[PDB]
């Protein structure tokens, strides 16, 4: 001398949106665990 949220891309839980490219953020997923 904002939460980091760790997921993994898997259906249903976690997806890419399908127009990802538009968004950023946590907008550019969608799912279960979202």
Same mark, same amino acid.
């Given at each position: +001398? +904002?939460? @980091?949220? +760790? +997921?993994?891309? %898997?259906?249903? /839980? @976690?997806?890419? =949106? =399908?127009?990802? %490219?538009?968004? %950023? &953020?946590? #907008?550019? /997923? #969608? &799912? /279960?665990? @979202?």
């Amino acid at each position: +001398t +904002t939460v @980091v949220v +760790t +997921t993994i891309l %898997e259906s249903p /839980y @976690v997806m890419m =949106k =399908k127009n990802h %490219e538009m968004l %950023e &953020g946590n #907008e550019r /997923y #969608e &799912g /279960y665990c @979202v």
